Design a protein around this ligand. Sequence first.
Ligand SMILES: CCCCCCCCCCCC
Ligand SMILES: [Fe+3]
Ligand SMILES: [Fe+3]
Ligand SMILES: [Fe+3]
Length: 428
Amino acid sequence: WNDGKRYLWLLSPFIPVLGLIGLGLFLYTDIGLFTWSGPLLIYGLIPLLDWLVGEDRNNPPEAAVAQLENDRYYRAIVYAYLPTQYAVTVLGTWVAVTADLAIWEYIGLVLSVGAVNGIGINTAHELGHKRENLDRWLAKLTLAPVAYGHFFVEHNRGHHKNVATPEDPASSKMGESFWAFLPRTVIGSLRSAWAIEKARLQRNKQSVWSLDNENLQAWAMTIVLFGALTACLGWPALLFLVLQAAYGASLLEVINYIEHYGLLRQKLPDGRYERCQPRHSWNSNHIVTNLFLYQLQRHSDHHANPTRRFQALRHFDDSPQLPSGYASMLIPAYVPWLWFRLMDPLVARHYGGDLTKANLYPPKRAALLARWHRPRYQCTDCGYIYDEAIGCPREGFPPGTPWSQIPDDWSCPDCAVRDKVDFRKLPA
Ligand SMILES: CCCCCCCCCCCC
Ligand SMILES: [Fe+3]
Ligand SMILES: [Fe+3]
Ligand SMILES: [Fe+3]
């Protein structure tokens, strides 16, 4: 079974090359428009190829899935992204602090570098799920230029666990404007990351202000990079880096807004939420954007099986579908009323006119209800095996720890989507 779209994945590592070409053209021909090579590319060009080329509801055969995850080329693709984002950042900073510029082209440079680092954040997300030790460090390195390093902890252990619940500071509520959502998600991510790492360290009988704190390990790389650039160039370099990092963080947060807008997970008869399923996240199958990003828009199979590699994701008929691709709907997300008009009918239709099973904004509940309501152990998902003789030293359990001493709320440390009570006791 020939994959077909094998070499077409190369567009994903090609975006930083596009930014580099734009910077080179600006430096050579001295034309201002070439600075805006990022905003134009991700606002007018991509949501034009997305219109030209339609859907694709295709899945790999089950037999071929075994060998798709053992191909080194699909990992070389992701690895190739790294040694061009740093080049783009360095060149952009040098140009912004050295060459004479007007205000608007300075803004264009900021936006271009920020966009490159936002797709860098996407690559970091793709890298941080793999259980290989080297990939975690590579993801931490990738998150450095955008200065948002706590993502590696938060996404892996507080978002994938609290999907589509009124507690997660990463799931939208229907009726909530984006600008009323950005501070909430940013602050909640900070607090949750700090709390998670402090809890783990305290369980390990060690102070939070230690070199083992992964948040500090992630932020040290950003501190080092920014300090080196500032020492080489000066304060304007620091200002430019701060602005571009802010824009990249905004780019990540708008996608977080889009993914799970309005959905909700139903409580089990006992006091816990049901396991995450493909019907708890929006999905789309637009070819061009799924090529420029690493199969990102299929945020159902990944977000219910957070170990399948990006080349083996599937399409599920039960999931809700977006009107278009992600890049197609970024302008109709900064504008609140337009986004509401586009989305609210779709949510109501998906829930069959019964909006008592939706994540409703508390201040706007009554209006929406008036307008729309017309009625040895193993993990069963990722295969991780816990052995009493080996134990889990990272989580604070020394070797020789009987299964009874594990807390009931403990979750699988490869996927964090199954609790202790969901494991299966393997036979001797
Ligand atoms: C939850 C996965 C994070 C995805 C990060 C992508 C952010 C950049 C997307 C830009 C699309 C135009
Ligand atoms: Fe998500
Ligand atoms: Fe993920
Ligand atoms: Fe697991």
